[PDB]
Design a protein around this nucleic acid. Structure first.
Lengths: 16, 688, 98, 178, 98
RNA sequence: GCUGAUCAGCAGUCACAUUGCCCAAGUCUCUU
RNA sequence: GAGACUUGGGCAAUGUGACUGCUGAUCAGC
């Protein structure tokens, strides 16, 4: 694996 | 258009209800909940000035922790014209004689301190419950089981019933744990622990007036992808730690005290080895949860801790133990640093290289946390932001604080806006990454946060309760929320207008945490509606249920002088006495608690103890007790331990080792009992 | 990119196009494959692969210009990092750069 | 059971006990947990300190009549010093039989006996190494147990003189002054 | 062309006893929306009441007796200048005239 | 042969009340 | 350093509430 999978920048604050 | 604050309508109504009947006020955390306490204190201030021997009275502000007691003492001092004293264990209150307490109450009208100090003060007859006009208990939801709040309330069932003070309970949350189902039973139990019923605002005008200091922050969730695969360097580190544990089990340090489990059923490693194992297991947890870089900071923290332990160690073998642990930590650090450095071929610019390695060498949890931080405070004014980060473990605070320091001095936009800081609970971790013997930095983390120097607080459940902090714009619950009180109270930290409350949840765990938060909201709704709809004329629990609430445990013991030996204080009194017998540094040994086996129990107690637990206690060699006190046959091990300690303390009192106030006799009392027999001729010369 | 700062495009390279070899130190690497290997999991793919591309320069973040910024900048090394970008991959304001 | 190498201890001390519980109480440090029939040695060393002090003072008062009282009291204070008692206890190998279970106490005892073996059990200048008070205390308790067993101060004095003879002869030639 | 809300300015300037308790943390409570900032010009009734009660509560919290002027003076136009600076600027005006 | 009903035995699963161990967080007091 | 308190997670062992697999007994129908 050798690398943590990257995350996208399009996350948002979903209301709970 | 005025500076001085006036009491509102709801505060006056609460005071009017409290002055006639004692009760518990349940208001959201803020200035409303303390102003009502101050007003209640002012209401019962009629007999403050007159001394006790002339029928005077005092007031008692009993707090949960020491820092909260200090804050409340300061608030009462700066908001009222009275004079208040601060009474906690740091003062050395234990060795205060009768006179030093008498003149102490004589000076101060209001006494503020931790619950244990006042419990010991009352049980030793330094004051009587008839000597106090009013008792104020803040954060009263902590009073369950054998917490000192409930022990203090137990003293009301014994003393004179016509001389009882007023009990006022302040709380922002009524429940403590996750027992959110069947709210009515828990609330009734709490109302029976104290001597009143719960009161809270119910008029729409009253709620709108309350909302001028309380605020409902908007709460959001930030999902991140959870993954399970792990790196190879992690496997190498885990193998090294396994090998080190196998070697450490044969470390052969000097003879160590025997450590057993909570119920004495199973043996355990010596605490010196337990500390090393605990630190390394915590490091493995941080490495698994937050990534290679977080492990890089964690290993420096471990280096510092083991260096401090090695310097503080007294034995050569313990020093060798810590040397081996430090060597293993250094090898792990070199491995992690090599792994980090085996990426730098991407570019030469180090400033963005740091951000690149941090984002590539971290789990999606840390990456999403850092990205949310960046988009939250991109180019803002450092004075315009004030945020908290709640994480679970102690060393996670320091690990994230170091990671945030490195990340902040890596990004052009966050370099001059965020100033991270951290604090943890008791047994404070060392706040340095260099293990220097002394540093000239003195200002505490919480003081820096208050003064505006720091605006990024990484705390672990310490700042949820008690400690006064200013309104916070953002509150990041990085770790999953666990308890109803934590959710409700950390939600109260985001007290500023339009505040943001952010939850970080894994993808595989979104439904669970959503259902849990929905349950918490429902429980809050049930609390509100149950308080609103319930109507009761007597508004105070009766005598029969109050007596039935406290009657499960062992009955207390009182002598002719009025002193009370509480069975839950028996272990403390026993060990405190055993801490005074030795006359050397190496003469300290605690009583040996031994649980009797079936054959021995049948041989001693016969069939009258079949199916029940018994505890035998062996006192040290110096003590007069050498009779192996046996506990009464009890249901479970904890009760039997309490019974054995209670019997040992009673025998000690009968033998004269406890000075008719159930504290170990000091040397002055021992020679005072002899002054009139051997030094009688001194009196003709005016000397004693 | 993690660098969300706004920046100024100086000129457009009509003769340039994706799949072109990087001029310095990366002749074996093209703009397209480098973009996929660096942020391809974030963009998915590139559309209009044969169209033009842009060259951009960064702006200062400072707001006080009264004091001289004396220092050893190594201006040739500073200008060494030339940035060539795919147009559809960068958000475009209509606001003039000058 | 508790007393191992009993004959060695009796021979080195110079006394043969009739009742051995006095010896057990003399050797029992307060940190030893497994002795539940006799107390620690504090009770014995309380009596033994005074007995040894009186006997030393009587001997120096009877024999050392040449030296002025200022020197007599210095000799007395040097002969009943804790360091002197520790050196005597090590020299006679009484530290082997101490019943204790503390790690730091044992480490200090071992370091001190190692340092004393460097000097050949000679009393050095009032000794840079911590000296365990427990050694002097167990020697005093041993003297007390010897007295209580025989109920004869003359036999006790014989034991004390046999133990202290090198130090008595040396300190009567020079007076340790600090 | 940008300033504090009008009503909070009126309260701040027209109440000398009340002007010594407003601090940056009390200013955080004035999170105005687009409509308030752009058209209305001043904070709403609920925001105003929340802000003023927060300022009044400063008299009992750990902020009592503090000096927020060093971080909030620029909002009201005040500034602190050392006496030496005044003296040297008087002498500097003399010097330019000379 | 086929199905239902009752009843006993066992195994597996679900919930609850006890108990025990391990880990985590927070709190207090004694003592140097 | 010792002792104690409240809370949560994991696991195991007892009880008890429900169901299921399977077998036997008693009973009806075919």
């Amino acid at each position: 694996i050798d690398r943590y999978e990257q995350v996208s920048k399009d996350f948002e604050f979903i209301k709970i | 258009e005025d500076v001085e604050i006036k009491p509102r309508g709801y505060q006056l109504r609460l005071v009017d209800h409290l002055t006639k009947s004692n009760g518990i006020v349940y208001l959201p955390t803020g200035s409303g909940k303390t102003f009502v306490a101050i007003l209640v204190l002012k209401r019962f201030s009629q007999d403050f000035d007159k001394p006790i021997e002339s029928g005077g009275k005092r007031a008692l502000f009993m707090c949960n922790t020491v820092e909260l007691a200090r804050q409340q003492a300061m608030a009462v001092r700066r908001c009222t014209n009275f004079k208040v004293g601060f009474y906690v264990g740091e003062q050395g209150v234990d060795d205060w004689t009768r006179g030093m307490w008498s003149d102490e109450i004589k000076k101060n009208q209001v006494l503020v301190g931790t619950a244990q100090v006042f419990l010991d003060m009352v049980t030793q007859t330094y004051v009587a419950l008839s000597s106090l006009s009013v008792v104020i208990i803040d954060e009263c939801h902590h009073g369950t089981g054998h917490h000192p709040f409930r022990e203090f309330m137990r003293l009301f069932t014994i003393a004179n019933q016509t001389k009882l003070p007023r009990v006022v309970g302040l709380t922002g949350v009524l429940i403590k744990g996750n027992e959110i189902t069947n709210v009515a039973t828990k609330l009734k139990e709490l109302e029976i622990t104290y001597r009143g019923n719960i009161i809270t605002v119910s008029d729409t005008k009253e709620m709108e007036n309350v909302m001028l200091y309380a605020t409902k922050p908007t709460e959001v969730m930030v999902s991140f992808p959870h993954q399970e695969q792990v790196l190879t360097v992690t496997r190498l580190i885990s193998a090294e730690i396994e090998k080190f544990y196998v070697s450490l089990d044969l470390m052969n340090i000097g003879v160590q005290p025997i450590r057993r489990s909570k119920s004495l059923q199973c043996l355990r490693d010596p605490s010196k080895k337990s500390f090393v194992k605990q630190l390394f297991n915590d490091f493995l947890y941080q490495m698994k949860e937050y990534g290679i870089y977080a492990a890089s900071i964690a290993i420096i923290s471990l280096i510092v801790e083991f260096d401090i332990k090695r310097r503080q160690a007294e034995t050569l073998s313990v020093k060798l133990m810590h040397r081996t642990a430090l060597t293993l930590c250094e090898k792990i650090r070199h491995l992690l640093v090599q792994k980090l450095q085996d990426m730098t071929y991407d570019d030469d610019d180090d400033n963005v290289n740091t951000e690149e390695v941090i984002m590539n060498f971290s789990t999606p949890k840390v990456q999403r946390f850092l990205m949310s931080l960046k988009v939250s405070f991109a180019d803002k004014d450092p004075k315009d932001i004030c945020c908290l980060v709640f994480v679970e473990r102690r060393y996670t605070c320091k690990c994230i604080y170091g990671l945030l320091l490195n990340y902040i001095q890596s990004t052009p936009e966050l370099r001059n806006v965020l100033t991270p800081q951290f604090m943890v609970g008791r047994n404070n971790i060392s706040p340095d990454f260099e293990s220097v013997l002394e540093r000239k930095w003195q200002k505490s983390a919480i003081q820096q946060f208050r003064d505006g120097n720091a605006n990024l607080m990484i705390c672990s459940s310490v700042l949820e309760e008690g400690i006064d902090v200013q309104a916070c714009n953002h509150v990041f619950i990085l770790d999953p929320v666990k308890t109803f009180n934590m959710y409700v109270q950390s939600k109260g930290r985001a007290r500023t207008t339009e505040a943001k409350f952010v939850l970080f949840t894994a993808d595989k765990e979104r439904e669970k945490t959503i259902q849990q938060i929905y349950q918490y909201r429902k429980a809050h709704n049930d609390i509100a509606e149950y308080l609103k709809d319930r109507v009761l004329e007597k508004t105070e629990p009766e005598l029969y249920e109050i007596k039935g609430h406290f009657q499960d445990d062992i009955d207390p013991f009182t002598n002719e002088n009025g002193a009370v030996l509480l069975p839950n204080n028996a272990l403390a009194i026993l060990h405190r006495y055993c801490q005074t017998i030795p006359t050397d540094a190496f003469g300290f040994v605690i009583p040996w608690f031994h649980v009797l086996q079936e054959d021995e129990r049948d041989r001693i107690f016969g069939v009258s103890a079949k199916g029940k637990h018994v505890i035998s206690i062996n006192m040290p060699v110096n003590c007069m007790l050498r009779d192996t006190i046996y506990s009464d046959p009890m249901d479970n091990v904890k009760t039997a331990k309490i019974s054995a300690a209670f019997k040992a303390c009673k025998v000690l009192y009968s033998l004269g080792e406890l000075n008719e106030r159930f504290v170990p006799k000091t040397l002055k009392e021992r020679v005072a009992s002899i002054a009139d027999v051997h030094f009688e001729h001194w009196n003709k010369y005016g000397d004693s | 990119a993690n660098y969300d700062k706004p920046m100024l495009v100086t000129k457009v390279h009509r003769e340039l196009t994706p799949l072109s070899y990087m001029e310095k130190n990366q002749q074996d690497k093209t703009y397209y494959e480098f973009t996929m290997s660096k942020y391809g999991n974030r963009i998915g793919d590139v559309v209009h692969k044969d169209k033009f591309m842009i060259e951009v320069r960064d702006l200062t973040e400072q707001l006080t210009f009264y004091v001289h910024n004396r220092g050893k900048f190594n201006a040739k090394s500073k200008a060494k990092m030339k940035v060539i970008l795919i147009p559809e991959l960068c958000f475009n304001f209509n606001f003039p750069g000058d | 059971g508790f007393l191992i190498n009993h004959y060695y201890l009796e021979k080195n001390l110079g006394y043969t006990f009739k009742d051995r519980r006095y010896l057990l109480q003399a050797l029992t440090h307060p940190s030893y947990p497994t002795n539940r029939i006799t107390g620690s040695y504090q009770e014995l060393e309380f009596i033994g300190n005074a007995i040894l002090d009186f006997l030393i003072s009587a001997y120096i008062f009877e024999n050392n009549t040449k030296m002025n009282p200022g020197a007599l009291t210095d000799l007395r204070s040097a002969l009943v010093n804790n360091t002197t008692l520790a050196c005597i206890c090590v020299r006679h190998r009484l530290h082997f039989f101490i019943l204790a279970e503390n790690a730091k106490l044992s480490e200090i005892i071992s370091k001190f006996v190692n340092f004393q073996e460097s000097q050949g059990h000679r009393v050095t200048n009032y000794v840079n190494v911590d000296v365990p008070k427990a050694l002097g205390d167990v020697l005093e308790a041993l003297i007390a147990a010897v007295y209580l067993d025989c109920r004869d101060l003359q036999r006790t004095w014989e034991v004390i003189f046999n133990l202290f003879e090198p130090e008595l002869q040396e300190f009567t030639r020079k007076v340790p002054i600090n | 062309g940008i300033s504090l809300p009008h009503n909070v300015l009126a309260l701040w300037r027209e109440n000398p006893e009340f002007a010594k308790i407003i601090g940056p943390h009390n200013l955080r409570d004035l999170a105005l929306g687009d409509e308030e900032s752009l058209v209305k010009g001043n904070c709403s009734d609920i925001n105003y009441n929340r802000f003023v009660e927060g300022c009044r509560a400063n008299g009992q919290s750990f902020y009592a007796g503090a000096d927020f002027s060093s971080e909030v003076n620029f909002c009201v136009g005040l500034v602190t200048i050392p006496n030496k600076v005044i003296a040297d600027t008087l002498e500097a005006l003399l010097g330019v005239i000379v």
